[PDB]
Amino acid sequence: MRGLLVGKMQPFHRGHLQVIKSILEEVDELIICIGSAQLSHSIRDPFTAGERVMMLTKALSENGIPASRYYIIPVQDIECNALWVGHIKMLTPPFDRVYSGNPLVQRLFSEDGYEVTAPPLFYRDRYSGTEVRRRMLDDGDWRSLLPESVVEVIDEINGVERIKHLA
Amino acid sequence: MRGLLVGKMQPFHRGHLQVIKSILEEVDELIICIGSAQLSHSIRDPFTAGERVMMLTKALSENGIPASRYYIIPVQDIECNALWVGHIKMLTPPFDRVYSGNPLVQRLFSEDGYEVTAPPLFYRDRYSGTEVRRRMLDDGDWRSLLPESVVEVIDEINGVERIKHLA
Amino acid sequence: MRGLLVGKMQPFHRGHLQVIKSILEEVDELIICIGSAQLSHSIRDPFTAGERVMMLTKALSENGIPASRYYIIPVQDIECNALWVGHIKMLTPPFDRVYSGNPLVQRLFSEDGYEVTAPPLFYRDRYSGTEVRRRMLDDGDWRSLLPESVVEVIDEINGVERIKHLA
Amino acid sequence: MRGLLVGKMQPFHRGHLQVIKSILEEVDELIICIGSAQLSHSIRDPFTAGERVMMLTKALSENGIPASRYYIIPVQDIECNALWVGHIKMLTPPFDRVYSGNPLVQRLFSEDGYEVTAPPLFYRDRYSGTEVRRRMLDDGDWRSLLPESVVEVIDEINGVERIKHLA
Amino acid sequence: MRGLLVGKMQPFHRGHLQVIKSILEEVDELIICIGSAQLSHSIRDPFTAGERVMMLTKALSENGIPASRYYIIPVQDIECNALWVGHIKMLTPPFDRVYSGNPLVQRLFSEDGYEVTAPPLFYRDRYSGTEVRRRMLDDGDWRSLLPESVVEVIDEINGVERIKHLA
Amino acid sequence: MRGLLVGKMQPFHRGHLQVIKSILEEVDELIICIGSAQLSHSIRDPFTAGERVMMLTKALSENGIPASRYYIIPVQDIECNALWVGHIKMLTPPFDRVYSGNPLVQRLFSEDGYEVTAPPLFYRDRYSGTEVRRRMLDDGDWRSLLPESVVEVIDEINGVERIKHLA
């Protein structure tokens, strides 16, 4: 039983970790696709796919989740939404269920015949990429929104200095 | 200490496994990029990136190599060789050394300032994607050239029927 | 005498039908290019090119316009506006006049040396893709804005459920 | 009942016409996709998609086949074969059966769950794009291989002068 | 000693000329990249790369700056910001310093290890592409913001008629 | 009076220099487009566009040709030959005549309505990119085929070591 979760992870936050843990209770393995893998250095998409791979890797490992239970696969975006589900299938192992709170992702997989689950949102008011990046820019408390390992990655790659300069 | 290995893995064979094991003796983790992730269903590139991810995953796991010791990242090809090293960096975790027997890959990383190691070839006369695919097409003994787990993947996805039809 | 009409047809409405009929009174055949053929599943561009081909086909046929009097050709968008006129020429039969109310389309063809006609707008306050899609989303009366055959196509492909989910 | 036929039509020849007529005896409408719509001015792909649209249109009309019985849709090629079937679906009306003698096309649609029919070849030794273009270049008898209407199109667009210059 | 300046030059204005002159006092040659070379015919990017090449050429020549002191190189934009610095390097001669007031350009080159200088802004309230284009559209005094040679180019290519039609 | 010359310049050789000098006797300025600006690090296309810009610049300057008499513009290739002439126009200043010995280039510009001149070939048996690169690889005398300034550029960028490694 393999599930699929897709997200920009800009950056990977506590909401992401929580949903992943719950998902791992109903599936044997979880395919985690880092979408928009081609975007980086913008206010909405500051981190490269590689930096995000490290964020995910450290965070999951830090939380004791065995690496054998998940796949981290960067996925560049494409121009045709009608071909995106096929695009994901082509780059990933086979999967039985799709977990997503993103309307577009839900509708695309739904139309393709996949069962789509929308997990309950975990503190959607604070655990969102938008809030995290807003706090980084306005000097708010973004650190509490992310697993400690992610904060370390961001510090190491000078993530805040980057996003502030770009803004 | 993290190394980087790039290959089409069309399909993943015993030569690949051997070089990976030796590399894992000098580095802590190995980033394994599956190149030409956009190509599939052709005589030279029959398998999708996703099918190759499964081949690698099963094979490495079958050989007792812990998943925490490697990263499997599909990498689509790009038009400009001059930007390829940057392309790889953008999609991967940081790495210290590059292992490759491919002249182009060696020269590109070399010009970029990376130390490149060309591991000794393991039975280059039989352990090559070209030979494997040739045997699949001419009904030769391709199975002995691949780890058992890879053969199982190919059987499951009807790899031989596909490549034969395409030829 | 062949004319050219380009439009997103998202979806094909009564305004489109009316302008086509009038155009067919001054030209022998009309080339109808469905622009942005690569876009689908978005609030501004909900339908695939194929679904739009059916909308046009059924509507024109429903209105007794012989198929021998027009060409339905999907045209993907391209990055360079400076090459778009050439892009259209490359995918279509030769044409003598261009009919369009779109400023960009008018200027591009004009600069290329083509005579461009801007037909009078037919109820521009209700007959527009924007209004149709707005009514579909807010449960307004979108059906009256489209030929009956188009409504049937939309019902069949669950167009409203799609656009509502995406919103 | 709608069928699908895909071909480069470089140029449209008597073999194409014959297979289309037979297909039209088992389906109500035939979707005819002109593949490699982006290629032109090369020895293997001399004609633009638009020129080919005219070739098909004139030929089918010349042979009394009603325009309401077919769709002529140019389809640009894409880099990922794994997404091509989806690419075709996205640009076309729905279809029940696929007719093709091309191994790749057959395997792709087959893997996607479509029934694929390989019509008998009509004089494959003379009725092929390769032979036609070879005769045009070596001053052989290419005219007898094409419907008269197609020859007229080629004469009008100076097709032979083009291909000879390119060679 | 060679410097690098990148800009859309939509259109080339007095601010551009001033910064170039000052830069030419600290470097032997200046590489001038016209960014977004693929965009044209839009309100934000009205002129083609070729038209901009003429604007730069005439203006610099008009101001007595020898052609041997600079390189005018059109550079199309790319999807990955992470590869852009590499993209520029690939299309240009080697350079020692980068001059730019654009935050993104500064951060990208900075992260790549280049020294980046942000020249003082020359009348930023009037000397900006945005103001120039705004005046062209609202019939303001755009001519005083540009070198005379640039105005002549714009008049010759009917730049104002174009941008007004597009708006 | 402005002419246009397009070439890969892989690398710029004595034949190129000779044709340019003769052309400069009938035109006031010469636009020199370095085609395939996106290709580098391959046996057929070893040098980046930037390296070629330097080769041209040094060679022309070395031969006393004033920089004000020419434009060096890198041009990436595109997928549609039917749009290439438009692609060139978009990136360059206006031109009156096209000089080329390349059949494709000649036919494309010819069909677009341009007068195309095919200058006499200068020692075509030795002055060709193919011969130069062949000698570099087989240790033949490639230096005599290129202007001295070009040899210096190649030495400086380790061009021979690169092409030999790639082979």
Ligand SMILES: NC(=O)c1ccc[n+]([C@@H]2O[C@H](COP(=O)([O-])OP(=O)(O)OC[C@H]3O[C@@H](n4cnc5c(N)ncnc54)[C@H](O)[C@@H]3O)[C@@H](O)[C@H]2O)c1
């Ligand atoms: N055509 C295309 O190229 C195309 C089409 C669709 C989607 N995409 C890609 O999909 C990606 C979008 O992913 P996204 O917007 O979902 O990214 P995201 O990082 O914001 O969200 C990832 C997922 O995590 C979960 N999640 C997020 N916050 C949560 C919280 N607080 N509590 C619980 N669960 C939470 C949701 O399932 C969500 O979908 C992008 O890369 C986009 O480009 C591409």
Ligand SMILES: NC(=O)c1ccc[n+]([C@@H]2O[C@H](COP(=O)([O-])OP(=O)(O)OC[C@H]3O[C@@H](n4cnc5c(N)ncnc54)[C@H](O)[C@@H]3O)[C@@H](O)[C@H]2O)c1
């Ligand atoms: N511009 C670009 O897009 C660009 C530039 C360079 C390379 N690439 C990509 O790089 C990939 C090519 O990888 P490849 O040709 O090396 O693939 P491969 O699967 O044939 O080889 C993978 C690697 O495995 C090792 N190996 C193979 N056989 C072995 C044996 N018998 N014994 C020991 N070691 C062995 C070598 O290090 C080799 O490089 C492609 O996807 C290519 O497109 C892309």
Ligand SMILES: NC(=O)c1ccc[n+]([C@@H]2O[C@H](COP(=O)([O-])OP(=O)(O)OC[C@H]3O[C@@H](n4cnc5c(N)ncnc54)[C@H](O)[C@@H]3O)[C@@H](O)[C@H]2O)c1
């Ligand atoms: N570079 C590029 O890729 C490029 C450049 C220009 C245009 N395009 C494409 O052109 C398409 C845009 O077409 P559009 O905006 O005109 O689509 P549309 O469907 O809104 O309008 C189609 C045409 O129908 C007519 N029309 C619409 N409503 C009417 C009414 N009520 N009464 C009478 N006539 C009416 C007008 O002539 C109009 O231009 C897009 O696909 C766009 O991407 C592409």
Ligand SMILES: NC(=O)c1ccc[n+]([C@@H]2O[C@H](COP(=O)([O-])OP(=O)(O)OC[C@H]3O[C@@H](n4cnc5c(N)ncnc54)[C@H](O)[C@@H]3O)[C@@H](O)[C@H]2O)c1
């Ligand atoms: N990834 C991709 O972009 C991708 C993948 C697959 C195919 N394609 C496209 O498919 C197209 C290829 O079409 P093709 O090679 O079949 O073109 P074609 O014109 O040679 O043949 C068209 C079809 O006509 C029929 N036919 C041809 N000669 C005949 C004869 N003498 N008698 C009877 N029937 C005959 C066959 O069914 C054949 O497949 C190309 O445009 C190719 O690029 C694209």
Ligand SMILES: NC(=O)c1ccc[n+]([C@@H]2O[C@H](COP(=O)([O-])OP(=O)(O)OC[C@H]3O[C@@H](n4cnc5c(N)ncnc54)[C@H](O)[C@@H]3O)[C@@H](O)[C@H]2O)c1
């Ligand atoms: N990924 C990518 O494709 C990518 C990433 C970064 C940048 N770019 C490209 O970079 C280009 C952007 O250039 P831009 O925004 O700087 O263009 P611009 O023409 O507005 O400015 C050009 C430069 O001129 C100088 N300048 C402008 N006005 C001045 C004034 N009044 N006084 C003094 N100096 C002045 C500044 O150094 C400025 O950066 C675009 O083509 C963009 O697409 C591309």
Ligand SMILES: NC(=O)c1ccc[n+]([C@@H]2O[C@H](COP(=O)([O-])OP(=O)(O)OC[C@H]3O[C@@H](n4cnc5c(N)ncnc54)[C@H](O)[C@@H]3O)[C@@H](O)[C@H]2O)c1
């Ligand atoms: N669709 C497209 O992207 C498309 C279409 C056509 C051409 N192109 C581009 O055009 C470029 C090809 O240029 P090319 O093949 O001519 O390059 P080249 O460097 O071999 O030749 C350049 C030109 O120099 C002249 N020349 C060469 N050797 C000479 C000699 N010994 N004596 C006298 N004159 C001599 C000829 O006019 C020749 O065309 C490529 O970059 C190609 O990709 C692109």
